[PDB]
Design a protein around this ligand. Structure first.
Ligand SMILES: Nc1ncnc2c1ncn2[C@@H]1O[C@H](COP(=O)(O)OP(=O)(O)OP(O)(O)=S)[C@@H](O)[C@H]1O
Lengths: 370, 49, 380, 455
């Protein structure tokens, strides 16, 4: 019966997403403008009510200003609204940027808090103290004169929940948030490194205290030495642009960065210095104590005959990810669903444990220390 | 056959709508050209733009 | 089914909340001066090719169209409608009315610092002789132009700086910008890396236009690998236009009337990716690196990074400098902030010795350092 | 937490049937008064150690007999000893009439304990040369305790003035402070004193103000309310005189307070038959409509809220939409609404109330991101009050942000109030709905310090 409630909630949220002047003075604004408005570029403003502009085709004109709002808000470097009759300077353009700003801006917290992963709470406690504490409880930093950390690197074996940690911190926040898969810079475009970078961090500064979240750029740490005999492409120049944007000049502000990698030694050690990126966090193949918690989460709301013990599977083999546990908990459920059965016995878990674990295959010892 | 004067007319231009703004208008970037805040027809909603 | 109850009537009252607004939905400096300005004109700025003799008969280009043969209007100053001056040309009378400034490009004005960020000379401790040499480079010819004259020697107008990441290049940059007195200009290297053909060359032109307006100005490069020092080219034929921009920079930079009263500081983490068309002295005259301070500088950077944080008045910095074998001011400051975080892990009023001990652990001994645990004695 | 948990009725019924039995007399010790409060204040001094640079710094925030006057209040609500109480002289002599009420009551506010010390501190300011010192002094006697009841008679005896003499201001502080003092099964003797109070009807608002509010504090938790001749009398004597509409606002306050205690009351229909008229008494209708409907799964009045929320009279909008933080206080995830997305600026005031004081998550302070930035001085005044009630740098970060907002005088006062804030029990439900007519004189703000909802 709850599905009706969830569907009505989603459709009413869409209804709210659809729920998004002057009788004659606004019509005079409609004649203060020519209706095909345009986008230009101020070069100078000789302030005697006519300005010089620049166009996307490059024709630059003494064009008169028609102020309704304060006309001294717009600057050289800020665009204008020019007509097609005399390209008349119309007025208020709130400062717009690329289309690629709303693209990297997640508008939801679609998943849940630290109650989602199972057990790492020493370093989950670290990212806690380095994001959740400086944001929500910023007492002692002012009260002991000590500045909070800025950069956090996630690494280790993959499928530990780096994505899960990412979305978990994407839950518990009131600061604005941005989602950047930072490897997107494969163009054949010279320049165009700094365009995304400068506009991203300008937007980040203009909105709020925020997190600027780069995700999986472990390939792009291109060895910091050359490309071999002839290489130079743009990629070094773009990462150096991001480096200078981070820890050059022009004080950082209330901007946070969390980063995640699978392999870590192939990175660029001109970034991994503290100050530029502060924290580094290991996510290893955990233990046989929080595997119980990962099975506990993955057997929270599934039909399990409690006769079986997952601790038998934990006692079987000891090195696998929590994603492997999720794969087992779904796959044994499918093996139960072979023949319309209620709950899951032991042997579905056995066949599913064997089934998922077809990963490591090498070879031939060791094995033969011995 | 008399209807075919409508075929005899210049049709339209394509346009990149980056994002709409308040007060019943949108933005349009023409295919090689710059961006242009333009007006809408009576048949289209910004909820659908 | 109590959760069904909970979520269902929650969303139902939320639907009511939507229905609330759904049912509750039902010139003097701006308007009377408009039509007065409507008979103005959209007349175009230009750029003048030449001047004929005895008459204007001016030939002109705007940007892209053609090369325009024009008149001047009658109310001009016909003297200074010369070459290199952008002027305004009509759409009916085709004649020059009003001159304009040149293509100033006020994104090249945007790389000037325009401020003075505070990092004092008393904060950059550890390198009291490298910064002494850079002080000789910067402060002394801009204040005492005697001993160059009285001995007959030349100023080091270019100084490259190289070394490990974390070292203090940024600090020395903003340190001399703290006590500057001159026109200081930051240079993002990728302010030269624009899209279209032959424009970063013109960016170097904009640089030298700003340079030769004034006196004793300060161009500061940083990250010139973004500009580049690699003439990486064989039979692949890819990225080469930035090298054209950089050779333009060398041309207008040094050789055949160089800068003058201009002192340029550069920086790179990668000296082995440079071009020996800038390694030559006369261009770059001090290849000053920095190195890791032994103990006195590391205790000094402790003093600077702990004078303004709550610590115990009993702790030393000799032993803490010991347990930094190889480290920088960034790593030292990370130790300070990390021990502060440990003080937040307790509830202290100040920091203690063991706070910085475990912070040294976290920074250096809990660095990554691969692979990883060095548990052996063999030494002690 | 027995005395915190209990309402006005059952500690007086408890102290009368336990006045009969008591079985050890220690429940007559504990469960009336004075033993919720005897362990706390010494242990408040002991385990806490509060410094002096907010007395001096937050007590240094300049001067101007308002901000300074407010600062006295801020210093006064400091409670490490009753130091700001005994800080010399010439600070209250700079003070003026209704602020002299606030400062004469402020020695009440520093010390809501020390029964024996209350008489010997207020006694200098008792029966003094000034009307406001003596009337705010008996007000302070009503503040400090609720079980003494021997401070009644020096004030109680004087009260009658028959139009507008001194003891009517002692009636304001002493009818109000005695409303602070006792909650019987139905105390009737103090209400027989209240019959020449409403029959007196001074042009001073807070006579009938603390009449309705004080008899309501006596009458909150009544047995499904009552439509008795007390509040029936103030309905008929209310509709007697249509003058000074603050009367037509604060009398339905105490009306709806007597309506509190309801489970099933038809008193909205009864006062609907007796009362309703031109929107003064239809605003009384919406006040009884607010107070009779504390909150349940009863969404039909929430869609009634949806429709009559769009009413053209924009003060029944104010209280009728203001009922929300009473109604849905437990299922508070729905409590974020689009009241800021509306435009009837008092509605943004209503949501600004509706956050309030609990622990105040990041979404609430996120709403104070926009509500912090507004330009009207009653709404920019309205934001720091609930903003620093909801948090009782971090805390002081929006405060210095308000210093960035202004640096009017109202705004300065609002900032002072926010600083004071920085540093279904009915007792915390009444006084802020008493605060809801703030856009007014400092004479109204002479009672602003009677929202006594914190230990
Ligand atoms: N003596 C010092 N005192 C204080 N901080 C220091 C000192 N030496 C280095 N630092 C730190 O190092 C920073 C300056 O050096 P860098 O930022 O590494 O310059 P850089 O641009 O990062 O160099 P690279 O190679 O381009 S990353 C300072 O902001 C401090 O964090």
């Amino acid at each position: 019966l709850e599905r009706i409630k969830d569907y009505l909630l989603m459709e009413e949220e869409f209804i709210r997403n659809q729920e998004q002047k002057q009788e004659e003075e606004r019509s005079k604004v409609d004649d203060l403008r020519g209706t095909p408005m345009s986008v230009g570029t101020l070069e100078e403003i000789i302030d005697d009510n006519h300005a010089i502009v620049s166009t996307s085709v490059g024709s630059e004109h003494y064009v008169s200003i028609l102020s309704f709002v304060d006309k001294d808000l717009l600057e050289p470097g800020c665009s204008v609204l020019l007509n097609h009759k005399v390209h008349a300077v119309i007025g208020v353009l709130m400062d717009d940027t690329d289309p690629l700003v709303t693209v990297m801006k997640v508008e939801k917290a679609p998943q849940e808090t630290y109650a989602d992963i199972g057990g790492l709470d020493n370093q989950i406690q670290e990212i806690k103290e380095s994001v959740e504490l400086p944001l929500t409880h910023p007492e002692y930093y002012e009260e002991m004169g000590i500045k909070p950390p800025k950069g956090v690197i996630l690494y280790g074996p993959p499928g530990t929940g780096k994505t899960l940690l990412a979305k978990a911190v994407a839950n518990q926040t009131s600061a604005t948030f941005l989602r950047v898969v930072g490897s997107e810079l494969i163009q054949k475009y010279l320049g165009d490194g700094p365009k995304l970078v400068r506009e991203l961090f300008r937007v980040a500064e203009e909105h709020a205290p925020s997190i600027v979240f780069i995700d999986e750029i472990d390939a792009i740490g291109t060895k910091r030495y050359d490309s071999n005999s002839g290489g130079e492409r743009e990629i070094q120049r773009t990462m150096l642009e991001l480096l200078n944007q981070l820890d050059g000049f022009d004080s950082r502000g209330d901007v946070k960065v969390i980063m995640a990698t699978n392999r870590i030694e192939t990175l660029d050690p001109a970034l991994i210095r503290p100050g530029r990126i502060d924290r580094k966090i290991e996510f290893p193949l955990p233990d046989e104590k929080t595997k119980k918690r990962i099975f506990q989460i993955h057997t929270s709301r599934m039909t399990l005959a409690d006769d079986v013990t997952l601790d038998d599977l934990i006692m079987a083999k000891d090195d696998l990810s929590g994603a492997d546990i999720k794969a087992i908990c779904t796959e044994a459920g499918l093996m139960a669903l072979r023949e319309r059965r209620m709950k899951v016995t032991n042997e579905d878990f056995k066949k599913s444990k064997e089934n998922v674990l077809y990963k490591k295959q090498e070879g031939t010892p060791e094995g033969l220390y011995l | 056959r008399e209807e075919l004067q409508l075929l005899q007319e210049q049709g339209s231009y394509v346009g990149e709508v980056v994002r709409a703004m308040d007060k019943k208008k949108v933005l349009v970037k023409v295919h090689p050209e710059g961006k242009f805040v333009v007006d809408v027809d009576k048949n289209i909603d910004i909820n659908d733009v | 089914q109590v959760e069904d109850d909970i979520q269902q009537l929650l969303k139902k009252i939320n639907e009511l909340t939507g229905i609330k607004e759904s049912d509750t939905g039902l010139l003097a400096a701006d308007k009377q001066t408009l039509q007065s300005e409507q008979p103005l004109q959209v007349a175009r700025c230009t750029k003048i090719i030449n001047a004929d003799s005895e008459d204007p008969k001016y030939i002109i280009n705007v940007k892209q169209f053609a090369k325009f043969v024009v008149d001047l209007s009658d109310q001009v100053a016909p003297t200074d409608i010369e070459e290199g001056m952008r002027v305004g040309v009509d759409r009916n009378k085709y004649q020059i009315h009003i001159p304009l400034p040149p293509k100033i490009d006020p994104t090249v004005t945007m790389m000037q610092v325009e401020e003075k960020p505070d990092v004092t000379y008393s904060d950059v401790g550890g390198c009291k002789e490298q910064i002494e040499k850079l002080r000789e480079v910067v402060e002394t010819p801009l204040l005492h132009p005697e001993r160059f004259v009285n001995l007959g020697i030349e100023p080091p107008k270019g100084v490259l700086l190289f070394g490990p990441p974390g070292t203090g290049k940024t600090l020395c940059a903003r340190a001399v910008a703290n006590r500057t007195d001159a026109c200081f200009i930051r240079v993002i290297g990728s302010e030269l890396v624009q899209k279209y053909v032959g424009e970063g060359a013109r960016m170097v032109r904009e640089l030298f236009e700003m340079a030769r307006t004034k006196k004793a100005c300060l161009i500061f490069f940083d990250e010139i690998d973004a500009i580049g020092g690699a003439r990486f080219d064989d039979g692949a034929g890819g990225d080469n236009e930035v090298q054209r921009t950089m050779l333009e920079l060398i041309n207008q930079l040094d050789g055949f009337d160089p800068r003058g009263n201009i002192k340029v500081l550069m920086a790179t983490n990668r000296p082995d990716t440079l071009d020996p068309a800038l390694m030559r002295p006369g261009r770059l005259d001090r290849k000053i690196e920095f190195s890791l301070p032994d103990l006195e500088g590391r205790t000094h950077i402790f003093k600077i990074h702990a004078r303004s944080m709550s610590v115990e008045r009993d702790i030393r910095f000799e032993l803490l400098a010991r347990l930094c074998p190889n480290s920088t001011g960034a790593e030292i400051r990370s130790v300070c902030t990390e021990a502060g975080m440990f003080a937040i892990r307790a509830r202290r009023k100040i920091a203690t010795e063991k706070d910085f001990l475990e912070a040294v652990n976290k920074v250096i001994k809990s660095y990554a350092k691969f692979s990883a645990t060095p548990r052996y004695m063999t030494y002690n | 937490f027995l005395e915190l948990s209990e309402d006005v009725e059952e500690y007086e019924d408890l102290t009368e049937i336990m006045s009969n039995v008591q079985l050890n007399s220690n429940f007559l010790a504990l469960a009336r008064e004075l033993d919720i409060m005897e362990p706390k204040v010494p242990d408040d001094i002991y385990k806490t150690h509060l410094e002096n640079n907010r007395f001096g710094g937050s007590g240094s925030q300049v001067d101007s007999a308002r901000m300074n006057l407010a600062s006295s209040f801020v210093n006064g609500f400091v409670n490490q000893d009753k130091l700001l109480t005994d800080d010399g002289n010439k600070w209250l002599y700079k003070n003026k009439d209704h602020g002299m009420l606030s400062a004469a009551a402020s020695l009440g506010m520093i010390l809501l304990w020390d029964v024996d010390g209350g008489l010997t501190q207020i006694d200098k300011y008792l029966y003094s040369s000034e009307d406001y010192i003596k009337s705010g002094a008996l007000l302070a006697c009503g503040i400090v305790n609720s079980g003494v009841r021997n401070e009644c008679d020096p004030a109680l005896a004087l009260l009658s003035d028959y139009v507008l003499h001194n003891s009517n201001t002692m009636r304001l502080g002493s009818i109000f402070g005695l409303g602070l003092a006792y909650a019987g099964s139905n105390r009737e003797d103090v209400l027989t004193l209240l019959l020449p109070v409403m029959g007196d009807s001074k042009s001073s608002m807070e006579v009938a103000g603390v009449t309705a509010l004080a008899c309501g504090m006596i009458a909150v938790g009544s047995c499904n309310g009552d439509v008795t001749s007390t509040i029936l009398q103030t309905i008929m004597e209310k509709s007697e005189t249509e003058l000074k509409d603050t009367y037509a606002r604060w009398l339905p306050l105490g009306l709806g307070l007597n309506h509190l205690g309801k489970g099933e009351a038809i008193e909205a229909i009864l006062a609907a038959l007796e009362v309703v008229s031109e929107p003064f008494r239809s605003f009384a209708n919406t006040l009884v409509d607010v107070c009779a409907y504390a909150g349940s799964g009863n969404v039909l009045k929430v869609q009634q809220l949806l429709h009559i929320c769009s009413e053209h009279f924009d003060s029944k909008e104010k209280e009728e939409d203001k009922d929300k933080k009473e109604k849905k206080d437990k299922d508070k995830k729905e409590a974020p609404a689009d009241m800021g997305a509306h435009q009837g600026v008092a509605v943004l005031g209503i949501a600004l109330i509706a956050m309030g004081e609990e622990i105040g998550a990041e979404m609430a302070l996120r709403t104070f991101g926009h509500l912090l930035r507004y330009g009207e001085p009653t709404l920019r005044r309205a934001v720091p009050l609930a903003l620093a009630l909801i948090s009782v740098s971090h805390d002081a970060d929006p405060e210095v942000s308000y210093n960035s907002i202004f640096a009017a005088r109202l705004a300065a006062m609002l900032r002072q109030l926010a600083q004071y804030h920085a540093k279904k029990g009915t007792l915390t439900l009444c006084p802020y709905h008493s605060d809801r007519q703030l856009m007014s004189q400092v004479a109204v703000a002479g009672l602003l310090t009677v929202l006594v909802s914190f230990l």
